[PDB]
Design a protein around this nucleic acid. Structure first.
Ligand SMILES: [Mg+2]
Ligand SMILES: [Zn+2]
Ligand SMILES: [Zn+2]
Lengths: 112, 24, 22, 135, 91, 76
RNA sequence: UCUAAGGGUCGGGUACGAUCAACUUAGAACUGGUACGGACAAGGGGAAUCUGACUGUCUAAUUAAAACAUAGCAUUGCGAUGGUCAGAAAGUGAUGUUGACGCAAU
RNA sequence: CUUGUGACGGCCCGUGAAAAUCCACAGGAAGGAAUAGUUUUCAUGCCAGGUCGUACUGAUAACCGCAGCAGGUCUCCAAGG
RNA sequence: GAUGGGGAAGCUCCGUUUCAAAGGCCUGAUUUUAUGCAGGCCACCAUCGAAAGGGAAUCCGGUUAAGAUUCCGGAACCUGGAUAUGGAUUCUUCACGGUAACGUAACUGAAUGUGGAGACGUCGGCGCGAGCCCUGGGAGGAGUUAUCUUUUCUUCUUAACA
């Protein structure tokens, strides 16, 4: 039934002043300030969370290696897999559309 | 059932020890 | 970072190539 | 009729080589024991050769005309077949089902697939196959 | 069971504000909170986000529409006469 | 950092950065309820602390004798 | 002092049994100086009239109201070289990151 | 019970900050090996981290109300019946 | 809230990107050498403004008459800079594996562009976690004992970081 205190000079319950009660090896209860939780990185197109990317505060991404921040695909840590797939499909199909459009538009005015 | 582990352990210790050195 | 980090990387490579120049 | 033949060129849409152009050398419509789906035994380009102009004299040309190939089993649902085609005779005998599961055989098949792709690229063949799909 | 005889969603307003005002508010909130057919994905998944913003939960499209309904009659007749003028401009 | 292989522990002791090691004995009970001596080895480097646990007294003795002459061993 | 109902987890060739743990409700006897939400805690109610629709606001230190506000209704001005307002002046401002389903004044 | 969090749902003519800072992707400039290199986003190893505050009260006696004034003054923790 | 400007007899007023010739950035090239000349890139455009907003990184035990996340002992982490060794990669120069979602100790990437994080209301119910509360067995200590009570109270703990 021990009661705890803030360990810093902020006495207010702000977003950066979150505490958690822990039990020390001395057998007493003590507050422990916890940092704010990280949000998962989002896809650029669909806006959903990228799978396989570590979830850290933005300064902490400079400490981890490249494997924790990337996937082994084109647009790896940036776009979702289905978004990359559909833009590959879109790219190939409408360059083919442009080829067919070009040959038809040259052919009609070559005939006329 | 630690006899096999002991054999491997002794081999590791022997490899680490290099007190005897040949001079030529 | 990435900017001061790339500057530190090129500084390390430049120092290393200057000493292996000799 | 069916079109997924042993000489077609497709674009991979999933995996490490997504967006890369491959040539099918060995179809398998009714799958296998280790792959219970309609698949193929494609070979493709991981690193495309770069643009070559008049300014590069022969050293940058030999540097920029390098091709890094790969060989891969892929599901049909992870392929996008195209209207073009590419002849296969030089490496259809050296890439096959037993040349996988063996890194030495994969290395040896990738060497000769690389040699074939460089000779076809230094000849004026298949500009669409050797161009990079930009997406 | 049918809990209210006639007030419906305006039963949250109690006896306040007058019955004829509550009638208009009921008629517009039913349109405001109903679901609509998505013109792209074909499902009954379009909902109002804010006034004029109608987003489909399935295919994640977002259409600009009326304040309380997804399409107003003024916009319908405007789209009709734009289509008619576009067919006339070649003729 | 916990070391699972004795080879890794011995390699770390050879480092010039490591000059001292501590040994601690702890009493433990096995599944049958029989007591045995657990030996814990700790070596401190400039950047990290390494720990190795040995449940056999005979093996622990051999390990201590195999340590380099430059490394001094102290018991807690 | 009892009764009844409300569960979990394990068990079945190719209907149930075992174990474990909850406070919720209903009912029945019996009993007492008819007491029992036993202290604490805790709505007085009805029939009408005047007035303001309501929630809200104000005269800090004599007035909390029927006063003010309010949604609703209606009127007026204005299409930007503009309406309303500011500034001693300005190559100056507010509405205005605005445009009549708006801004401004009643 | 207090608190943190997740997936949701309701509400709006209200849809509920900005910047520093950090990371990734696209691109292919340039540099590059064979008797040798290229890499320090892998591991280990080396050095340094200046300035100012830091006691105590925070209220029927440490603040403001002429004062050791029943007044006023923001907030965290919260046992059993 | 300066500057460029424009008002004002003037103390000063307006304005904050404006009717401005508004600057600095990296590679280097040269190794009379200093840092000009080779280059190339970029156009925000002062500054002030939060001890409750955003934000790199520290915990436990002990210690004083009076200090402690600050001292002592132990154990960590971050930033800036030096740097060598091991590992990785390469004669197919700049990695392999998995159908795939993706995985790993690593596994070049300038200019330029794009994306993400920072970065976000309130209420309601439901799920999970931590601490506290309740409680059983056991190992210790204390209390009551005319009678009763295998009883009443108390200790049985585990930080950051990996
Ligand atoms: Mg990853
Ligand atoms: Zn996506
Ligand atoms: Zn839809």
């Amino acid at each position: 039934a021990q009661r705890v205190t803030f360990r810093r000079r902020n006495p207010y319950n702000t977003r950066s002043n979150k505490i958690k009660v822990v039990k020390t090896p001395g057998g007493i209860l003590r507050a422990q300030h916890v940092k704010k939780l990280a949000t998962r990185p989002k896809c650029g197109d669909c806006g959903s969370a990228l799978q396989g990317i570590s979830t850290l505060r933005p300064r902490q991404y400079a400490t981890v290696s490249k494997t924790h921040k990337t996937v082994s695909r084109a647009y790896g840590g940036s776009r979702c897999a289905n978004c990359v797939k559909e833009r590959i499909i879109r790219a190939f199909l409408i360059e083919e559309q442009k080829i067919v459009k070009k040959v038809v538009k040259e052919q009609t005015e070559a005939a006329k | 059932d630690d006899d096999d582990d002991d054999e491997e352990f002794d081999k590791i210790i022997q490899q680490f020890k290099k007190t005897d050195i040949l001079k030529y | 970072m990435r900017a001061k980090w790339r500057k530190k990387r090129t500084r390390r490579l430049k120092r290393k190539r200057r000493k292996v120049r000799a | 009729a069916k079109f997924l033949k042993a000489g077609k060129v497709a674009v991979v849409v999933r995996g490490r080589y997504a967006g890369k152009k491959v040539v099918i050398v060995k179809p398998h419509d009714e799958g296998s024991k280790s792959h219970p789906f309609g698949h193929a035994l494609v070979a493709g380009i991981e690193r495309y050769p770069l643009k070559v102009t008049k300014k590069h004299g022969a050293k940058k040309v030999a540097k920029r005309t390098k091709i890094k190939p790969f060989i891969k089993v892929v599901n049909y649902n992870h392929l996008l077949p195209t209207r073009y085609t590419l002849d296969v005779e030089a490496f259809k005998s050296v890439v096959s089902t037993e040349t996988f599961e063996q890194p030495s055989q994969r290395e040896e098949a990738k060497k000769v697939v690389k040699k074939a792709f460089e000779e076809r690229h230094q000849a004026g063949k298949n500009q669409w196959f050797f161009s990079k799909l930009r997406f | 069971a049918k809990r209210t005889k006639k007030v419906g969603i305006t039963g949250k307003y109690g006896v306040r504000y007058g019955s004829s005002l509550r009638r208009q508010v009921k008629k517009l909130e039913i349109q405001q909170h109903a679901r609509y057919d998505c013109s792209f994905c074909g499902k009954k998944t379009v909902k109002r986000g804010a006034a004029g913003i109608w987003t489909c939960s399935c295919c994640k499209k977002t259409v600009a529409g009326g304040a309380y309904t997804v399409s107003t009659a003024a916009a319908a007749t405007v789209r009709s006469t734009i289509r008619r003028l576009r067919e006339m401009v070649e003729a | 950092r916990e070391i699972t292989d004795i080879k890794q522990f011995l390699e770390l002791t050879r480092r010039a950065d490591v000059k001292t090691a501590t040994v601690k004995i702890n009493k433990k009970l096995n599944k049958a309820g029989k007591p045995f001596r657990q030996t814990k080895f700790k070596v401190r480097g400039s950047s990290s602390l390494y720990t190795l646990v040995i449940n056999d007294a005979g093996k622990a003795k051999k390990l201590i004798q195999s340590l380099p002459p430059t490394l001094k061993v102290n018991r807690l």
